[PDB]
Amino acid sequence: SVSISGSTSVGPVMEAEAEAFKTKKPDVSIEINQIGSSAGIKNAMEGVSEIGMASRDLKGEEKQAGLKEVEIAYDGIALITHKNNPVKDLTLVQIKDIYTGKITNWKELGGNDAPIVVVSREDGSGTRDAFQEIVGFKAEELTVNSQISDGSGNIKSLVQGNENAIGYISFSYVDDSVSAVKVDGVEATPENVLNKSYKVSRPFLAVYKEENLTESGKSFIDFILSEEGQDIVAKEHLIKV
C-alpha cells in the first residue's frame, strides 16, 4: 500500500524501518524498490511512487515539481579499498587526483606498485553526486578508465573482488570485508560525521508530493522520525536526525 523507490544507500535502513513499522501498523504494507536517488526522485515527481528516497539534496527543478522533503538521517560516504591495501589514509585532493586520473598507480600514494582500479557509481546515483561535489570534480572530469558499478551492492562487490580497486559507498554498507580509508586523517565513523571532522557526508531524504502522501505514508515517515525509528537509523551506521 505505500510505494517507495530510490536510493540504494537508503535501502538497508528503509527495509529495517518497514519491518519494525509492521509491528506498529500490521495493516500497512511498505513496498521498497532500490533504483538509485535520481530515479526515485523522478518517480515521486511523476506520481509513480508515493515516497522517493534520496541520498542527496533535491535539485531546484525537482523541488519545483512540488516535492516536500523530510530529512530522515545523515550518512557518511566511505572510500573503500580491498582489505589489506597498505594505503589507509587519503586527503580529499588525493582522492580527486585518483578519480580524475591524475594518479593512476597505488605507489603514487605510498602503496603497492599496482594500477588503481577506479570504481564509480552509475549516473543518477545520489552518492556519486555528493561524492563529486565534496571531492571537487565534475562528471566531465571523471577518468575514462573508471569502472561503473550499478548500485551500492555492486560497488562493494567490485572492491571485494579486486585487490587494487577503490570505490565509494554509504557507511551503511561498510563491514569487515572491505576497508574504509581515513579521510584527511579522520576515521570514517558516524561519530566523526556528527562532529564534522569527517568531511564526506550527505542527507537521507524522504520526498513526496503533499497531494499523494496517504495517512499510511505519513504514519510511516513519522515512525522513522520517532525515537524508535531513529534508533534503527543509528543501528544501520547512520547519523540521527
Would you tell me which residues interact with Zn ion (CB under 5 A)?
57-58, 69, 231
Alpha carbons 117 and 114: distance in angstroms, whole number: 9
- Nearest CB to Zn ion, comparing residues 69 and 122: 69
Q: What backbone torsions phi and psi does residue 94 show, to the nearest 5 degrees? A: -60, -40
CB of 1 to Zn ion, least distance (A): 27
CB of 140 to Zn ion, least distance (A): 25
- Are residues 155 and 77 in contact, defined by beta-carbon separation less than 8 angstroms? no
Q: What backbone torsions phi and psi does residue 63 show, to the nearest 5 degrees? A: -60, -45
Q: What backbone torsions phi and psi does residue 3 show, to the nearest 5 degrees? A: -90, 125
- Nearest CB to Zn ion, comparing residues 69 and 184: 69
- Nearest CB to Zn ion, comparing residues 92 and 134: 134
Burial 58-84 (b: 16+ CB within 10 A, else e): beeebeeeebebbebbbbbbbbbbbee
CB of 132 to Zn ion, least distance (A): 18
Side chain identity at residue 156, one-letter code: K
Alpha carbons 31 and 3: distance in angstroms, whole number: 5
- How many C-beta atoms surround the C-beta of residue 110 within 10 A? 12
CB of 153 to Zn ion, least distance (A): 14
CB of 208 to Zn ion, least distance (A): 13
- Nearest CB to Zn ion, comparing residues 163 and 184: 163
CB of 29 to Zn ion, least distance (A): 25
- Nearest CB to Zn ion, comparing residues 69 and 133: 69
* List of E strands, 28-143: 30-34, 51-54, 67-82, 89-90, 117-121
Enter the C-alpha cell of residue 114: 599496482
- Nearest CB to Zn ion, comparing residues 27 and 61: 61
